[model samples]
Structures are given as structure tokens and as C-alpha cells.
Target: KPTENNEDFNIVAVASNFATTDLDADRGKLPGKKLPLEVLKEMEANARKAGCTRGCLICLSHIKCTPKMKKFIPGRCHTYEGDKESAQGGIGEAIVDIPAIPRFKDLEPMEQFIAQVDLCVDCTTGCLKGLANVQCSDLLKKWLPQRCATFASKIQGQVDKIKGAGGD
Candidate 1:
């Protein structure tokens, strides 16, 4: 069973809830679904401590994509479609410069964005669930392709990297 923990916030639960909930159908009640700013700030801090030093936390929680790349790559975590370039530098730069993981330096911008999404999914899922020795929910794996369908070219590359590093 996937046991819950009190020590850390469950970002996977947050992501899964967002993924499965019908946000459009409940537009008037959408605010309740959004994370409070303080919690999001804490998430950013925790992710950074976990070695997501490449602005993955910003992309995962705040900024979605760069100005030049928004049309091709959209936000993976939320439905807020506005440009957040001013808040963070650019999603492209972040993915290309991920220090803790393999940076997608040569891949196209779209591929790089997908690679980061994969990383975030893996990272957040592992954050709380790994402590309990439980696998990530199937909903998360299903949601992955849905979010990255725009650019599936480099998914296999990420998969290989994970496998090469002995990830299940």
C-alpha cells in the first residue's frame, strides 16, 4: 500500500489531483484546487534541497515555458497558460542546464522541455513514495504521455537514462 507521511508535502498527490480533476467543469470552484502561495514556496525550497537546482522547481510550480517556446511547449503542472518568462529566466535554459541530471543540451527545445517533465514526474513521485517503498501511482504514468504528447521524440532517451542509472 502507498503509505502517507506527515514529514513532507505530497507533491505527487497534488499533481495527480490536478491531472485527474476536471478543472474546466468546475471553473468557479477552481481556486480551491490551487495550491496556496506559501505551500508552493515550500515546495520550491524542498525541490531545490533535493538537487533540482536547474529551476525545475519554478517550471514545476510557477513558470511553464519560455516566450519563444510556449506555443510548442506548455506547462505540465497546471493549466495557467500565461507566459512566466519574467518570473524565471526560461524553461529552455533550465532544462539545458540541469546540474543534478543529464542536461539535454543537444535536443531541440521541445524535447528538452519533455525531458524536464519526465524528471519532475520522477523526482516528485520519488520524494514521498520512495520512503514508503511504494511505486508511483498509475495515474501519474498515464498523465506523463498526455502532458508530453506534443513532443514524444526524446522520451526514449530519458527512459534509457533512467534505466542506465538502474531506475525501475
Candidate 2:
């Protein structure tokens, strides 16, 4: 029933742990040298579970690595940029930190919720708040369902299902 043709709420077939955060194995390696192909691959894989995109930009910058180990394939971690980083005249940039918004933690994983918050522009202009709320909310409804399947509402099921189920 959760995977109905509703589109947004359908659970993707891929299994996600949403629990593991092991990435330190690659962190201890020397700075900037080409990371082992395996380590690089695993880091990217872990990004989905950990709700991070661009592999580890902090580590990437810390080590002074100029070239990426591979291309950035968009996954659950991607908010709006799809397969690339944001640009000046483009779809903005990748999120870097999560907002302290209430209730989001109940619907999405902590790592994922934070990543979505980080998608906002790092500016102080009046336009910043508007863009941040729109983009972040869109992803919250769209992306959160990829992990939380039981989320039902008017768009999901409304009070009909809730009343039928009886929350007592």
C-alpha cells in the first residue's frame, strides 16, 4: 500500500542501512594523493546512507586534493543540483549544514535532515530566506519518503487512513 503509484511516497527498491557512518578508514590516508579506488568507491556509497553528497568535501579540501576520485553520481544525498555542484547562474549549490527546524528530525534521518538544511545559500540577503524554505521543504517531502515509508497525510492518506487505523 505504501508503494502505490503515488510517485513521491513509493519506496525505492534499494536497501539503505541509514545507520552506518564508517568513513574514517579513508580519512587517515595521506593528504591529496590518489585515494585507493576501493576507498573512494566506498566513501561515495556511504554518502547515501550518511546523507552527504560530494563525498567528503571537508576531507577533500583538508588533503588539498585537486581532482576527484570519480564523478559525483547523484543519490538520496543530492537535494537539487542533481549530478553536479551549484553554480552562479545555475540551480544554486549543494547543501552543507542542516537547519534547526522542528519536526524534520521525526520524518528524516539526522544526517539527511542536516544535509538538506545545508542546501541553502550562505548569504544574508533578503532573498536567502525565501529560497531556503522553498527548496528545503520540497526536498523534505520528496526525499524523506525514500526512507520513511509510513508517512501518510492528506497527500499520503489523510485522516481517513488514520481514523481507520485508530491511534489508540
Candidate 3:
């Protein structure tokens, strides 16, 4: 069905509405609740306070916080195209079928953007879904470190802790 503009588009939506898995509760996380910007903000502040003298808060949010750590932006993120007021979880939305490449201000939006990119030896499938995960590509993964100067060292320290668990 062509729209009034004769333009077409496609998208992928991943959904999760939170869980009571001990892993979640043990970490003090609850379902049906927005991951607090305060919590995410705290992680960034913690990194800098813990002698992390690199990266802006932007880089820290991308590098340090896990994706499971969710946030609810009122209009920026809503439900999965249906079931209004379903504000209990996070849905990663990706839209492929692009007519041209897009620009991003930072790696996070770029991260979500690529999640929507469908891959193939060619576009012969006519912009089909589930063909590619630009999200998983090394190209996308590399952007955080290469594009964000502070991410390099911030992640380095994070890795150091993992490598020297007992040595810490």
C-alpha cells in the first residue's frame, strides 16, 4: 500500500517489559518502571569520581552503562506500535529500507540506527527484514572507541578491573 507521498519504509522492533529474575531484583531493578536517568547519571559521575579522568558524560553513558539499563523518553520512545501506555520496558526500534545514509550526533543513536539496517549481498530482497544486524557489526562497535576519545580509556579501566579482579 503506497502512502500519499508514494514513499515506503520498514522497521524492526525488539521488546522487553522487565522481569523478576533474581538477577534483576538482586541488582535492585524492578519491572514496569523506568530506568532512572539518575541511576544512569550516577554511573557516569561514579566513573569520573573513581579517578576516570576521560570522556564526556555522553561517552560514559554509551560505554559504561549496559543496554538492559533502560530509560523512558516520553515521546522519543513509546510502545511497539500498539497497546498504548505500555510503558513497562524498553523496545529497541530499528528502521531499514533507507533511500540514503543517515547522520548521527553520537554512537548511541547510530547504534540504534544500524540496528534497523538490513544486510545482504545486494538489496535484491527489496528491503526485507532480518537480513542483517548492523548493530552487531564490528564497524558499528568500533565507532564508540574511535569516535569517542574518552571512551577508549574509560573502557580500558573497566577492562582492567575484569582482568585484575583479585588484584584490585
Candidate 4:
């Protein structure tokens, strides 16, 4: 229905409460809990103490830590989004899960905007959650350029692939 201003808007919500699953716990994560930033840092610190040099903590977090962290966050994450409470687990992990493209067939027009707003919030929350991660200190120790490099490579690959497809 259109409002008096002839503007039609809708509001939708996702996972306002804690979420959990056996799969999440099995991976040593607590589902629906906010991301744990501390644990993320610890990984980096540990590596440094072990005498590692020049590695991106972000990638280590991605390919290595994420799975384990994902399993851990749900069981015990901060109740408040963006709080330092669950920094040990990792926040914003689900930002990637928000779907670059809409997956739901019938997403309301306003729902998309809501998603955008929520995602923005997730980023903020994720940052704050990082402070609380058990591994935050370690991540700071190593600068893993590979993660950044891969992102650039990914974009290049897509563009090149499109060029190969001969797009006008």
C-alpha cells in the first residue's frame, strides 16, 4: 500500500536474536553470537611468537580461522551487536553471507534497503567485535598482503573473463 506521500515502504528483519546449530558448535563456534575479535588477533600473535614473518592475518583468519571461529561464536557471543563482549569469537563473519545478489525470489523492495542498512550496521559491529577477539593481538603482528592481493586478482579475473566473453 502507498502512503499519503505516494511512497510505499516495508520493513523486514533478520536474526535479531541469538542463533545456534549443532553444526556451529561442532566447528567450535557459537552461532548467532556476535563475532569475536580477540581470538582473531591471538592467531597472529601466536604465529609471531613462533617466529613467523610477513603473512597477512586477514587471510589466516579467512582460510584458517574462520571455520573454527564460526563454530565458536554462536555458543557465546556478545548479546549487544558491536560490543566488545564477544571480540574473542569474531564479528561480521556473516557479512559475506548477506548475499551480494538477492537470493530470495520475493524480497520486498523496502527489504533490500533494510538489508543495506543492516549490513552497514554489521560492519560497525564487526569492527567493535574485533576488539574483543582472542586473536586480535596476533593478527596485528603479521601483515598478510596475500588476502589483499587475492581480492585484486579476483576482480582482475572477473574483468578479464568478461572481456574474453566479448561484452559490449
Candidate 5:
């Protein structure tokens, strides 16, 4: 049986739905467009120094908020700098409640999938608003398809489990 010990399975447990253009010949573009590689690298280094990794950066990039309700809402990644604009009132925070990417190992497979889907939707919406900069956007584009394929491959089992005799 597949288990969290397997990377693919673990990925299924942490799935996301922002992969519509994964197979596109021309990968979808970031709304904010590409920033200079040097600038992105610099920003990435700073983020790393502040304890934010690639995942945290991706999470931060796709954060959402309402224009009227600006307040820093914390995220699972625990990065204060990334969390600031997401929580504070702004035009970018005008739609979709921010969803947290939880620890996949802590939740059941089905529960994990649901949360992941929710997060993906929010992230997509956030991206549509051009909230994500180049580095985070690039990372998100890269990771989403990998995660999506893993989840797609395993989701059948989850579906069967849910609809099975003992399932809800």
C-alpha cells in the first residue's frame, strides 16, 4: 500500500490545483511579468535568511486579502515579512479568504486533498490579481504541475475510499 514514506504519496497528500497550463507549450505567464534574475535571486536570498523557503515564498506569493479588510493574517509558513501584506488591508486582499497549507502528515489523505484544493483555488485567484512576483510565481508554476500529477494519480484511491463501504 502507498504510504507517506513515498514522496509521490506525500505529494498527493499535499496536492494543489494550479496546474492548468502545466502542459502548455508556452508556460503561462505571470501577471506581474518576469523580474530580473539578479533581483529575484537577491529577494530569494533575503527570504531564505528570514526563514522562508521555496514553499513559504510560493505560499506568500499567492496570498489574498480584501481591500477593505487589511490586517496581517498569519500563515502556516510562519514568515512575518510575507505575512504582512497578506494580513494588512489592500486592493490585493479584496477576495477569497486565505487558506493555509497544513502539515500533510497530520491529516487524513482525503482531508489533506480538500485543504490542498482550497489553497490552490485561493492561490490561483491571488495570482490572477498579480500579487505574486517573479520568483515565487516561477516556483509556483513549477511545483503545481508536479503536485497535481501526483495527486491525480492517487486521487482514485481516495475516491474509492470515500465511497467505500466504511467510507462517508
Candidate 6:
């Protein structure tokens, strides 16, 4: 009854041990160079331009990473499980620490998720609150699937405009 057509973002597809915060491995590594302040500004600008009725920025689930390795000083130890109630929560043990990358505040809450290999990305009680003050306005966040459809429509319109312009 479920399909990719209506599923949340799954980082597992990116890394096998996404459920544990493994600092020794790739999870310890920060993401692409921090977005320049100007780019962050653009993200804000676009978020506003989208006129997207914003709500909770759910990752469809929480992400977990393992603890840092000792020799590695943070080797995969953090772990969490998701919850079945909300399509967003995972094994019910979702609690991850935000990395110290520049402009960590500007990154998506989901980007904050990391964990070891043998764990599952779970959910937490403070998730909605964790993302509370962010500037994201995704429709799926507001418990309004229709808004997501509209948001997609808007994106499609822009894509069509670009296509019409010969992708200049």
C-alpha cells in the first residue's frame, strides 16, 4: 500500500549505517562545504518566493548515527529506532546531535541525523520542536498533502519555463 510516490526521504539510500552516529566513518565527515551566507540567504528567499504554506519539516523519519570511535575519537555509537505511529518517526529512539559545521543552523534538521551501521533512524518527542524555529515552509510539514501537490505544481511550472527557454 506504500510506494516511493508517497514516502519520506531515506538517507539509508545514501549510507548503510545512517541509523548510528558513526564519527569515525563518513558520518563524522561534514557535508559539502558550508553554503555561503549568500546561498543561505537565497534558500530563505526561495522559501519565501515559493509562498509555500509551511508547517513541520519532517524527514519522513528521524536519522541516527553511531558514537565516535575512541581511536577515531567518535566511532559509530549513536543509535535510534523509528516509530510506527507517524510516518515520520522511525524506531522510536531518534535523538541526534547537530554537527559543528559552519552555519549548522542553516542546514536542514534532517541533515543533522547520523548513526551507526546496525541501527535504525528513529523518532523523538522533540522532533517537531527541534525543527520548530526553522525557516522551512514545506507543505508536507503542515499535515497537508494537498499543499505538497501544489508545491510540486509550482516546481513543475518553473521547470517548464526553463525548458521553454531552451534551458538557457
If scored against the real structure, what TM-score would every candidate get? 0.28, 0.18, 0.19, 0.20, 0.23, 0.19
Best prediction by TM-score = 1
Arranged by lDDT with the best first, the candidates are 1, 5, 6, 4, 2, 3
The best candidate in terms of lDDT: 1
Error of 1 at 76 (Å): 4.5
lDDT for 18 in candidate 2 is 20
The positional error of residue 151 in candidate 2, measured at the CA in angstroms, is 44
Give the range where candidate 1 is weakest over 10 consecutive residues by summed lDDT. Answer: 159-168
lDDT at position 139, candidate 4: 26
- Give the range where candidate 3 is weakest over 10 consecutive residues by summed lDDT: 159-168
**Candidate numbers, best TM-score first, in rank order:** 1, 5, 4, 6, 3, 2
What is the per-residue lDDT of model 6 for residues 22-122, given as tens digits with 9 covering 90 to 100?
32243344222221222223333333243322221222223233233322433222212222332234656443344434333344433333222113223
Which consecutive 10 residues in model 4 have the weakest lDDT in total?
A: 159-168
Which of the two candidates, 1 or 3, achieves a greater TM-score against the reference? Answer: 1
TM-score, cand. 3: 0.19
State in Å the error of residue 132, model 5. Answer: 19
- Score residue 16 of candidate 1 by CA lDDT: 30
lDDT of each: 0.36, 0.26, 0.24, 0.27, 0.30, 0.28
Model 2: lDDT to the true structure: 0.26
Error of 3 at 23 (Å): 5.2
Query: What is the C-alpha lDDT profile of model 4 across 1-168, one tens digit per residue?
Result: 222331111000012111122222322422223223332334434433444333222212222112233343432221222222222325442322235445421354344334433444323333323322323132222222222112222111111111011110
Q: Compare candidates 2 and 3 on TM-score and give the better one.
A: 3
Candidate 1 lDDT over 1-168, as tens digits, reads 222322223343234323433432333332323332233334334434444433333334332334444445433334432223323445442432454444454456676555556656534543433322322233323333333223332222111111011111
Once fitted onto the true fold, the runs of candidate 3 whose alpha carbons sit more than 4 angstroms away are: 1-31, 53-168
TM-score of 4: 0.20
Put down candidate 5 lDDT per residue, 98-124, tens digits, no spaces: 245435435444444345445543234
